[PDB]
Short mmCIF file of C-alpha atoms and ligand atoms in Angstrom, two decimals:
data_model
loop_
_atom_site.label_atom_id
_atom_site.label_comp_id
_atom_site.label_asym_id
_atom_site.label_seq_id
_atom_site.Cartn_x
_atom_site.Cartn_y
_atom_site.Cartn_z
CA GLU A 12 133.68 -86.73 -97.00
CA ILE A 13 133.24 -89.98 -95.03
CA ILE A 14 131.84 -88.21 -91.90
CA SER A 15 129.39 -85.58 -93.21
CA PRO A 16 126.38 -83.54 -91.99
CA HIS A 17 124.79 -84.33 -95.43
CA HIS A 18 124.49 -87.93 -94.24
CA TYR A 19 121.76 -86.96 -91.77
CA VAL A 20 119.24 -86.41 -94.55
CA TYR A 21 117.84 -88.45 -97.44
CA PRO A 22 119.62 -87.63 -100.77
CA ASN A 23 118.04 -84.83 -102.86
CA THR A 24 115.67 -83.98 -99.97
CA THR A 25 115.65 -81.78 -96.91
CA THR A 26 114.02 -84.48 -94.72
CA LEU A 27 116.02 -86.22 -91.93
CA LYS A 28 116.51 -89.97 -92.12
CA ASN A 29 113.96 -91.71 -89.94
CA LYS A 30 112.94 -95.12 -88.65
CA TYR A 31 109.63 -94.86 -90.62
CA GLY A 32 111.31 -94.65 -93.97
CA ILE A 33 109.19 -91.56 -94.82
CA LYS A 34 110.87 -89.20 -97.30
CA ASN A 35 107.94 -86.64 -97.61
CA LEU A 36 108.78 -83.81 -95.18
CA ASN A 37 105.13 -83.17 -94.23
CA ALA A 38 104.21 -86.85 -93.77
CA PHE A 39 107.29 -87.48 -91.61
CA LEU A 40 106.58 -84.40 -89.47
CA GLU A 41 103.03 -85.57 -88.75
CA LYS A 42 104.17 -89.10 -87.80
CA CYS A 43 106.91 -87.66 -85.64
CA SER A 44 104.49 -85.25 -84.04
CA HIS A 45 102.10 -88.10 -83.19
CA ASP A 46 104.78 -90.45 -81.82
CA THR A 47 106.63 -87.93 -79.67
CA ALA A 48 103.35 -86.75 -78.16
CA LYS A 49 102.79 -90.34 -76.82
CA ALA A 50 106.35 -90.43 -75.51
CA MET A 51 105.81 -87.21 -73.48
CA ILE A 52 102.69 -88.66 -71.83
CA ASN A 53 104.83 -91.67 -70.59
CA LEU A 54 107.91 -89.59 -69.81
CA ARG A 55 105.91 -87.24 -67.61
CA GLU A 56 104.89 -90.36 -65.57
CA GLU A 57 108.39 -91.79 -64.97
CA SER A 58 109.99 -91.03 -61.58
CA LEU A 59 112.43 -88.13 -61.19
CA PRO A 60 116.03 -89.03 -61.51
CA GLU A 61 118.60 -88.83 -58.72
CA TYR A 62 121.11 -86.93 -60.81
CA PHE A 63 120.41 -84.16 -63.35
CA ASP A 64 123.29 -84.43 -65.72
CA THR A 65 123.67 -84.77 -69.46
CA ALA A 66 123.14 -88.56 -69.20
CA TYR A 67 119.63 -87.59 -68.05
CA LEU A 68 119.29 -84.99 -70.78
CA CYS A 69 120.17 -87.81 -73.25
CA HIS A 70 117.74 -90.27 -71.62
CA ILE A 71 114.98 -87.87 -72.27
CA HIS A 72 115.92 -87.32 -75.89
CA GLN A 73 116.35 -91.08 -76.35
CA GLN A 74 112.90 -91.75 -74.85
CA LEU A 75 111.15 -89.04 -76.96
CA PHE A 76 112.68 -89.97 -80.28
CA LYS A 77 113.27 -93.75 -79.87
CA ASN A 78 110.73 -94.56 -82.57
CA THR A 79 111.69 -91.74 -85.03
CA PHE A 80 115.53 -91.50 -85.12
CA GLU A 81 118.34 -94.02 -84.91
CA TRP A 82 120.52 -91.49 -83.14
CA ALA A 83 117.94 -90.74 -80.45
CA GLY A 84 120.18 -90.58 -77.40
CA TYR A 85 123.16 -89.09 -79.23
CA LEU A 86 124.89 -85.74 -79.10
CA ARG A 87 125.67 -84.16 -82.45
CA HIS A 88 129.51 -83.84 -82.19
CA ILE A 89 129.80 -87.68 -81.94
CA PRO A 90 130.01 -89.47 -85.35
CA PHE A 91 127.08 -91.80 -85.82
CA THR A 92 126.91 -94.70 -88.29
CA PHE A 93 123.48 -95.42 -89.59
CA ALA A 94 122.13 -98.90 -90.31
CA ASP A 95 122.62 -98.04 -93.99
CA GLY A 96 126.32 -97.62 -93.45
CA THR A 97 126.77 -93.83 -93.87
CA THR A 98 128.28 -91.86 -90.97
CA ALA A 99 126.98 -88.40 -89.88
CA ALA A 100 128.04 -85.62 -87.43
CA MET A 101 127.23 -81.92 -87.25
CA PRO A 102 129.73 -80.11 -85.18
CA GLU A 103 129.01 -76.74 -86.80
CA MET A 104 125.26 -75.97 -87.50
CA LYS A 105 125.96 -72.92 -89.72
CA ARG A 106 123.88 -70.09 -89.08
CA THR A 107 124.30 -67.24 -91.38
CA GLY A 108 127.64 -65.51 -90.41
CA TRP A 109 125.71 -62.49 -89.13
CA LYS A 110 123.55 -64.56 -86.77
CA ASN A 111 124.72 -65.57 -83.22
CA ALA A 112 125.96 -68.89 -83.39
CA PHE A 113 125.71 -72.11 -81.31
CA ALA A 114 128.85 -73.93 -79.98
CA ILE A 115 131.20 -75.77 -82.41
CA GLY A 116 132.89 -79.18 -82.02
CA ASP A 117 134.44 -79.85 -78.60
CA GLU A 118 132.89 -76.70 -77.10
CA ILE A 119 129.72 -78.86 -77.00
CA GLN A 120 131.52 -81.32 -74.64
CA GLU A 121 133.21 -78.56 -72.64
CA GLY A 122 129.86 -76.76 -72.13
CA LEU A 123 127.90 -79.87 -71.12
CA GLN A 124 130.57 -81.13 -68.69
CA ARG A 125 130.48 -77.70 -67.13
CA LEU A 126 126.67 -77.86 -66.83
CA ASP A 127 127.05 -81.32 -65.14
CA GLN A 128 129.85 -80.03 -62.95
CA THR A 129 127.79 -77.04 -61.55
CA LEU A 130 124.55 -79.06 -60.91
CA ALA A 131 126.63 -81.61 -58.96
CA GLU A 132 128.32 -78.82 -56.86
CA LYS A 133 124.94 -77.20 -56.07
CA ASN A 134 123.06 -80.44 -55.40
CA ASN A 135 120.73 -79.84 -58.34
CA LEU A 136 119.75 -76.38 -57.02
CA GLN A 137 118.00 -77.98 -54.13
CA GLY A 138 117.90 -75.90 -50.89
CA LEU A 139 116.92 -72.53 -52.33
CA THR A 140 114.34 -69.77 -52.38
CA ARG A 141 112.40 -69.19 -55.60
CA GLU A 142 114.43 -66.15 -56.57
CA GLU A 143 117.71 -68.09 -55.85
CA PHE A 144 116.46 -71.06 -57.81
CA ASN A 145 115.18 -69.00 -60.80
CA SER A 146 118.37 -67.03 -61.02
CA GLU A 147 120.58 -70.14 -61.18
CA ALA A 148 118.12 -71.94 -63.48
CA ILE A 149 118.20 -69.03 -66.00
CA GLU A 150 121.98 -69.22 -66.35
CA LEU A 151 121.90 -72.97 -66.95
CA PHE A 152 118.90 -72.72 -69.32
CA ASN A 153 120.55 -70.03 -71.48
CA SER A 154 123.76 -71.89 -71.37
CA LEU A 155 122.21 -75.14 -72.63
CA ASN A 156 120.24 -73.19 -75.23
CA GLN A 157 123.52 -71.94 -76.85
CA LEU A 158 124.95 -75.48 -76.88
CA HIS A 159 122.10 -76.84 -79.07
CA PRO A 160 123.47 -80.33 -78.12
CA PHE A 161 121.32 -82.47 -80.32
CA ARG A 162 120.79 -82.29 -84.08
CA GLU A 163 117.03 -81.92 -83.40
CA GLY A 164 114.51 -82.04 -80.53
CA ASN A 165 116.39 -79.65 -78.27
CA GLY A 166 113.33 -77.58 -77.20
CA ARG A 167 111.16 -80.31 -75.81
CA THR A 168 113.95 -82.15 -74.00
CA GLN A 169 115.41 -78.98 -72.57
CA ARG A 170 111.96 -77.91 -71.37
CA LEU A 171 111.25 -81.16 -69.63
CA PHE A 172 114.74 -81.34 -68.08
CA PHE A 173 113.94 -78.04 -66.27
CA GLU A 174 110.36 -78.70 -65.47
CA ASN A 175 111.66 -81.71 -63.56
CA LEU A 176 114.69 -80.03 -62.03
CA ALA A 177 112.36 -77.41 -60.53
CA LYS A 178 109.93 -80.04 -59.21
CA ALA A 179 112.75 -81.91 -57.54
CA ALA A 180 114.12 -78.68 -56.07
CA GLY A 181 110.74 -77.71 -54.39
CA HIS A 182 109.68 -75.13 -57.01
CA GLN A 183 107.71 -74.98 -60.24
CA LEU A 184 108.44 -74.23 -63.94
CA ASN A 185 105.26 -75.06 -65.95
CA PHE A 186 106.69 -74.73 -69.50
CA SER A 187 103.44 -75.96 -71.01
CA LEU A 188 102.01 -72.44 -70.33
CA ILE A 189 104.73 -70.82 -72.61
CA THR A 190 104.15 -70.62 -76.32
CA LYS A 191 106.77 -71.46 -78.91
CA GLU A 192 106.81 -67.79 -79.86
CA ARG A 193 107.49 -66.41 -76.41
CA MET A 194 110.41 -68.77 -75.98
CA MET A 195 111.76 -67.72 -79.33
CA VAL A 196 111.75 -64.03 -78.43
CA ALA A 197 113.21 -64.65 -75.02
CA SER A 198 116.01 -66.88 -76.46
CA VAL A 199 116.74 -64.41 -79.31
CA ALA A 200 116.90 -61.48 -76.82
CA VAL A 201 119.60 -63.26 -74.81
CA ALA A 202 121.65 -64.53 -77.72
CA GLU A 203 121.70 -61.21 -79.57
CA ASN A 204 121.72 -58.44 -76.85
CA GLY A 205 122.63 -60.47 -73.78
CA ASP A 206 119.29 -59.18 -72.54
CA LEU A 207 117.82 -61.38 -69.72
CA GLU A 208 114.66 -59.34 -69.05
CA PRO A 209 112.26 -61.31 -71.29
CA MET A 210 113.54 -64.66 -69.78
CA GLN A 211 113.32 -63.42 -66.23
CA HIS A 212 109.79 -62.35 -67.04
CA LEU A 213 109.14 -65.80 -68.58
CA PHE A 214 110.44 -67.79 -65.62
CA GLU A 215 108.56 -65.40 -63.27
CA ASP A 216 105.26 -66.07 -64.99
CA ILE A 217 105.95 -69.85 -64.98
CA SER A 218 107.06 -70.12 -61.26
CA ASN A 219 105.00 -67.58 -59.27
CA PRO A 220 101.80 -69.34 -58.11
CA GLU A 221 99.83 -66.11 -58.32
CA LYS A 222 100.59 -65.79 -62.04
CA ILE A 223 100.42 -69.50 -62.90
CA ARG A 224 96.74 -69.57 -61.92
CA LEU A 225 96.16 -66.56 -64.22
CA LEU A 226 97.72 -68.41 -67.23
CA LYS A 227 96.01 -71.76 -66.44
CA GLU A 228 92.65 -69.98 -66.54
CA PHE A 229 93.43 -68.36 -69.88
CA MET A 230 94.91 -71.43 -71.65
CA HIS A 231 91.75 -73.28 -70.59
CA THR A 232 89.58 -70.92 -72.64
CA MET A 233 91.51 -72.06 -75.73
CA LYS A 234 90.40 -75.67 -75.27
CA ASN A 235 88.25 -76.97 -78.13
CA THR A 236 88.05 -73.60 -79.77
CA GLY A 237 89.84 -74.83 -82.87
CA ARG A 238 92.62 -72.22 -82.26
CA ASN A 239 96.37 -72.51 -81.54
CA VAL A 240 97.96 -69.85 -79.37
CA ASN A 241 101.49 -71.36 -80.05
CA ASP A 242 101.88 -68.65 -82.76
CA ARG A 243 101.05 -65.83 -80.22
CA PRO A 244 102.91 -64.50 -77.22
CA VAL A 245 100.86 -65.03 -74.03
CA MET A 246 101.98 -63.13 -70.90
CA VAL A 247 100.93 -61.98 -67.51
CA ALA A 248 101.19 -58.16 -67.20
CA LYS A 249 104.53 -56.99 -65.64
CA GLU A 250 104.26 -55.10 -62.43
CA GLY A 251 104.72 -51.41 -63.17
CA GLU A 252 104.25 -51.60 -66.96
CA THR A 253 101.30 -50.13 -68.93
CA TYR A 254 99.57 -52.03 -71.75
CA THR A 255 97.04 -50.59 -74.23
CA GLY A 256 94.76 -52.53 -76.57
CA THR A 257 91.32 -54.16 -76.93
CA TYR A 258 89.35 -56.05 -74.32
CA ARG A 259 89.06 -59.87 -74.84
CA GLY A 260 86.78 -60.60 -71.75
CA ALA A 261 87.10 -61.41 -68.04
CA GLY A 262 86.95 -64.43 -65.84
CA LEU A 263 86.75 -64.95 -62.03
CA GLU A 264 90.45 -64.47 -61.23
CA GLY A 265 91.63 -62.55 -64.31
CA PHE A 266 91.02 -60.97 -67.72
CA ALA A 267 92.64 -60.81 -71.21
CA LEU A 268 93.82 -58.06 -73.64
CA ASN A 269 94.97 -57.98 -77.22
CA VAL A 270 98.11 -55.78 -77.79
CA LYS A 271 99.46 -56.16 -81.36
CA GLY A 272 98.84 -59.96 -81.67
CA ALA A 273 99.84 -60.75 -78.03
CA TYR A 274 97.60 -61.74 -75.17
CA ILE A 275 98.26 -59.89 -71.92
CA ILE A 276 96.61 -61.36 -68.88
CA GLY A 277 95.80 -59.37 -65.67
CA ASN A 278 94.32 -59.96 -62.22
CA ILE A 279 90.67 -58.96 -62.18
CA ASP A 280 91.23 -57.06 -58.90
CA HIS A 281 93.79 -54.65 -60.54
CA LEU A 282 90.95 -53.17 -62.67
CA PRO A 283 89.19 -50.06 -61.31
CA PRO A 284 85.90 -51.47 -59.89
CA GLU A 285 83.85 -48.95 -61.98
CA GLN A 286 85.51 -49.82 -65.30
CA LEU A 287 84.71 -53.54 -64.94
CA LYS A 288 80.99 -52.65 -64.79
CA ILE A 289 80.76 -51.08 -68.28
CA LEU A 290 83.54 -52.93 -70.14
CA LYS A 291 82.45 -55.09 -73.16
CA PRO A 292 84.61 -57.31 -75.51
CA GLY A 293 86.33 -55.19 -78.13
CA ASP A 294 86.48 -52.04 -75.96
CA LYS A 295 89.76 -50.12 -76.15
CA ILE A 296 91.31 -50.07 -72.68
CA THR A 297 94.54 -48.77 -71.12
CA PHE A 298 95.68 -50.71 -68.05
CA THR A 299 98.61 -50.33 -65.60
CA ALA A 300 99.81 -53.17 -63.41
CA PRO A 301 100.30 -51.93 -59.84
CA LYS A 302 103.36 -52.38 -57.61
MG1 MG B 1 112.27 -78.50 -84.14
NI1 NI B 2 128.43 -88.41 -98.64
NI1 NI B 3 99.33 -94.09 -82.64
#
């Protein structure tokens, strides 16, 4: 057909059409990675907007991908004619039938107008306590996650939309402290079971100053190690829960565990004073977060 999803990609390849003219998937992904990283640095310096609507969501995407994709600012239900003449649009997405699916066609527009409508009615979530703000933000975040409004680049732009919404509303949501894996599990939990607990946990860790300082400390230790924790879920221990694993070493404010490929982080003062004395790296330890 004239308007086809196949028109997003170079023929015979799996690699999206790009402003660089690169057809090798790996080469393209490296160039994109480099360019979008520069865009973030500048985007994080621009002033906050007055309105947080989809126009702003689009501005972000447009600014991030201006040098990579011709359709940078564009939502995926709106037919887009490339410079080369072909016209593309992906209303569907097509998961496997058994997977939970994103919104189709005009649902994208219904959903997004709704998101704009609620943020306007609630003055961008502005006069609220942290629990009030986090509760409202989680609905909107989950909501926007199921719309998957752009063909690609949803994650980064969604993350920066909310980091900025929070900042404007007098709160924090440092998404840079969340790995790609943790976001994946939290999103999957909500889309499959309707389970909010992982996300609540995620936002809690990202907004509570007492837990943000714990993560900042840990993420620092990764700097110049050669490693990449993006593969690995990094969390602050939930209050009440019990974690068991192997000791990864302490700091001033907090320590780290390894529980089946995941880093759990705890306040140093929650350890029994007498354990801390004789506890070396690699020691098996059970820990329970207090009230
Ligand atoms: Mg991606
Ligand atoms: Ni065609
Ligand atoms: Ni460069």
